[PDB]
């Protein structure tokens, strides 16, 4: 009923010191929050973004109340999905009773505001991202380390470039950088080359004309494919398949930091992977009380090979217990320092 921090820390140190076993990562919105350039963090959290959209913009506020009838407090993703659905229907302006084209103007305004807010550079070489990048280059592992992100910024890319870290995000090309899909499944990539997948897109995505071919590059004004999933009839599907395929590797380990497990598709994929492969292990790291994560505790009770780490609570092997607050590893900077110490 009581757990020792030092035992888990030693277990993690032994795990990370291994070379052949595949490793991965998940970087959520809670990671950039732990890094601050001004008094506030360089990038706000999801709640901060929602509040900024709400107070920055009676007809406009109708949509927020309309979605709240069947769902809890709406977020950026829900609002963007509703705008996409509204644009799907041609004569959808009668619901808001505001013409039939103000939706496009609002979408352009919010996209421009999000791009302006997110297009920030991380200052200083002492950022945890640089520490992680250095740690990746320290040990020449037999299998490269993959990285999954659900953010919108390009902090990981810039950190990787700063320390000369080769990678491959599924895009090849200098000017247009068209999406190559056969080389992803062929998977005869360089051994030293790492991989980075942005599950929710970023500012460098732009959609072409009726050809609809996706490409990445310099962001353009009034265009940003920062849509989480949007809709289609796609890179998102192959990225999900890549994650699921990785989770089936023998003795695979996946580490989550700053992720609140609020999503449903990701949790379903993780549960399916854990059930399919009995040897996979996932380290759920939190920076709050475990009572806030109902889905995470439900999944930890359902699955046996899932480990959760919170400030004052932990669930290990279907047996919730208490620490001997504690577990200072929840913060992203502490994780980076641990990785740097392990590499050194």
Partner 1 sequence: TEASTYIGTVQDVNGANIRVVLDINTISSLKFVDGQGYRIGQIGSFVRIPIGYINLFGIVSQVGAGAVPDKLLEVEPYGHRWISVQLVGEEGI
Q: Binding pattern to its own copies, positions 214-233, x when CB under 8 A?
A: --xxx----------x---x
**113 contributes a contact to partner 1 by CB under 8 A:** no
Q: Concatenate the DSSP letters of all residues of 59-71 into one string.
A: HHHHHHHHHHTTS
**In this chain, which of 94, 302, 318, 324 binds partner 1, going by CB under 8 A?**
318
**In this chain, which of 1, 55, 101, 186 binds its own copies, going by CB under 8 A?**
186
**In this chain, which of 7, 17, 109, 138 binds its own copies, going by CB under 8 A?**
138
56 φ/ψ angles, rounded to the nearest 5 degrees = -105, -20
The closest alpha carbon to 303, from 267, 329, 330, belongs to 267
Segment near its own copies (CB under 8 A); pick from 4-12, 34-42, 87-95, 281-289: 87-95
**175 contributes a contact to its own copies by CB under 8 A:** yes
The residue behind tokens 């780490």 is 309
**173 contributes a contact to its own copies by CB under 8 A:** yes
The entry of partner 1, its own copies, none that residue 322 binds, CB within 5 to 8 Å by partner kind: none
Q: What is the CA radius of gyration of the chain?
A: 21
> Binding residues for its own copies, how many (CB under 8 A)?
63
The entry of partner 1, its own copies, none that residue 175 binds, CB within 5 to 8 Å by partner kind: its own copies
Which residues, 6 or more positions from 229, have their beta carbon under 8 angstroms from its beta carbon? Answer: 81, 236
**250 contributes a contact to partner 1 by CB under 8 A:** yes
Burial 159-183 (b: 16+ CB within 10 A, else e): bbeeeebebbbbbeeeeebebeeee
Which residues, 6 or more positions from 91, have their beta carbon under 8 angstroms from its beta carbon? Answer: 100
Measure the CA–CA gap between 286 and 16, rounded to whole angstroms: 19
Identify which of residues 111 and 253 has a Cβ nearer to partner 1 in the complex. 253
- Is residue 116 within 8 Å of 43, Cβ to Cβ? no
Identify which of residues 86 and 253 has a Cβ nearer to partner 1 in the complex. 253
**In this chain, which of 6, 38, 69, 191 binds partner 1, going by CB under 8 A?**
6
Residue 199, CA atoms < 13 Å, CB-side half-sphere: 18
DSSP state of 55: H
Q: In what order do the strands lie in the sheet containing 306-309?
A: 2-3, 319-323, 314-316, 306-309, 281-285, 253-257, 23-27, 146-149, 195-198
Residues that bind partner 1 (CB under 8 A): 6-7, 9-11, 13-15, 17-18, 20-21, 140, 250-251, 278-279, 281, 304-305, 307, 316-319
Q: Which residues of this protein are in contact with its own copies, per CB under 8 A?
A: 66-67, 69-70, 85-86, 88-92, 94-96, 125, 137-138, 154, 157-158, 160-162, 164, 166-169, 171-178, 180, 182-183, 186, 188-193, 204, 216-218, 229, 233, 265, 268-269, 272, 275-276, 278, 302, 304, 343-344
């Amino acid at each position: 009923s009581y757990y020792d921090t030092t035992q888990q820390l030693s277990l993690l140190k032994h795990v990370l010191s291994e070379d052949k076993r595949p490793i991965a990562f998940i970087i959520a919105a809670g990671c950039p929050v732990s890094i601050r350039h001004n008094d506030a963090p360089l990038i706000p959290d999801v709640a901060g973004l929602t509040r900024k959209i709400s107070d920055s913009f009676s007809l406009l506020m109708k949509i927020i109340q309309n979605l709240k009838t069947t769902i809890p407090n709406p977020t950026i993703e829900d609002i963007l999905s509703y705008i996409r659905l509204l644009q799907q229907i041609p004569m959808s302006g009668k619901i808001h009773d505001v013409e039939n084209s103000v939706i496009n103007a609002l979408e352009e305004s919010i996209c421009e505001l999000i791009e302006e807010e997110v297009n920030v550079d991380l200052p200083g070489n002492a950022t945890p991202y640089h520490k992680i990048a250095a740690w990746i280059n320290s040990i020449n592992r037999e299998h490269q380390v993959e990285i999954f992100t659900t953010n919108y910024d390009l902090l990981m890319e810039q950190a990787l470039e700063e320390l000369n870290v080769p990678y491959f995000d599924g895009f090849v090309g200098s000017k247009r950088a068209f999406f190559d899909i056969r080389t992803i499944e062929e998977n005869k990539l360089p051994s030293r080359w790492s991989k980075l997948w942005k599950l929710h897109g970023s500012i460098n995505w732009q959609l072409d004309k009726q050809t609809q071919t996706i490409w990445r590059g310099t962001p353009s004004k009034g265009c940003s494919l920062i849509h989480p999933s949007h809709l289609k009839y796609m890179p998102y599907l192959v990225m999900m398949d890549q994650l699921k395929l990785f989770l089936n590797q023998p003795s695979a380990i996946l580490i989550t930091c700053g992720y609140s497990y609020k999503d449903q598709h990701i949790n379903e994929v993780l549960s399916q992977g854990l059930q399919t492969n009995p040897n996979a292990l996932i380290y759920g790291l939190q920076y709050d009380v475990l009572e806030n994560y109902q889905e995470a505790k439900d999944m930890a009770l359902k699955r046996s090979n899932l480990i959760l780490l919170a400030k004052d609570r932990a669930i290990i092997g279907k047996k919730e217990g208490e620490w001997k607050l504690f577990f200072k590893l929840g913060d992203f900077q502490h994780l980076a320092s641990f990785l740097e110490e392990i590499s050194q």
